[PDB]
Amino acid sequence: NNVMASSSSDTDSDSSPDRGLSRMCCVYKIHPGGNIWSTKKGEQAWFRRRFSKYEVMAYDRCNLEWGFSGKPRGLTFEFLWDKEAAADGTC
């Protein structure tokens, strides 16, 4: 037919949703702009932008759910890393 290669799953999720002591959050890089933005998995975050805040909740497997916020299309969400929140519990 055609040379088909193996489409492996790069983004695989072997992660505990939250460990309490280690409240893991997803850290992304928002483009354009180059804004480092993180969202704590399991809770809702608000994407603070120039003239707007967008309600969005981060899932356990690291993926977002944008609410009625209706954030702009054409933005690039580059997943940087999975990290834990700060000592106060926020990321």
**Please, are residues 67 and 60 in contact by the beta-carbon 8 Å criterion?**
no
Buried b (16+ CB within 10 A) or exposed e, 22-37: ebbbbbbbeeeeeeeb
* Experimental technique behind these coordinates: NMR
Reference 58, options 39, 77, 75, 72; nearest CA is 39
Residues with Cβ within 8 Å of residue 50, at least 6 apart in sequence: none
Q: How many CB atoms lie within 10 A of CB 80?
A: 13
Residue type at 64 in one-letter notation: L
Q: Which residues pair with 15 in a beta bridge?
A: none
DSSP 63: -
Contacts made by residues 3-11, CB under 8 angstroms, sequence distance 24+: 11/79
Burial label for 6, CB within 10 Å (0-12, 13-18, 19+), is exposed
Sign of the dihedral through C-alpha 31, 32, 34, 37: negative
Q: Considering only the C-alpha atoms of the chain, give the largest distance between any 2 of them, rounded to a whole number of Å.
A: 56
